[PDB]
Design a binder for this molecule. Structure first.
Ligand SMILES: *[C@@H]1O[C@H](CO)[C@@H](O[C@@H]2O[C@H](CO)[C@@H](O)[C@H](O)[C@H]2NC(C)=O)[C@H](O)[C@H]1NC(C)=O
Ligand SMILES: *[C@@H]1O[C@H](CO)[C@@H](O)[C@H](O)[C@H]1NC(C)=O
Lengths: 49, 33
């Protein structure tokens, strides 16, 4: 589960426990328009890509 | 979930019962196991 950083939650955001740095194949950051009402995304795969 | 695959999944007598089904490797994929 995840928590809200704006107001706050009684619980704590805990979805991973790896203390070291695991093997990663992709790690990037993207900025999106904050003043937006709806967001659309596509996620598909073919031939292992 | 818990579980025949007897005697071995390669030469099992009932392939429809053993959950380890034999497949083939596709394009751009690896051996599933
Ligand atoms: C993508 O953005 C997040 C959030 O700004 C980055 O996470 C921060 O990472 C630094 C260490 O590099 C920490 O000191 C901050 O506390 C993190 N912020 C949060 C909100 O957790 C993340 O590093 C960025 N990723 C890349 C590749 O730039
Ligand atoms: C974000 O969207 C609003 C309206 O939906 C628009 O006015 C604004 O220019 C957008 N932001 C950027 C950086 O384009």
């Amino acid at each position: 589960h995840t928590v809200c950083k704006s107001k706050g939650s009684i619980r704590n955001e805990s979805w991973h426990i790896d203390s070291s740095e695991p093997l990663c194949l992709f790690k990037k950051n993207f900025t999106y328009n904050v003043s937006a009402d709806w967001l659309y995304f596509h996620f598909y795969q073919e031939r292992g890509v | 979930k818990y579980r025949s695959c007897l005697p071995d999944p390669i030469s099992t007598y009932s392939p429809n019962t053993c959950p380890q089904k034999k497949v083939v490797v596709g394009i751009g994929e690896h051996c599933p196991g």
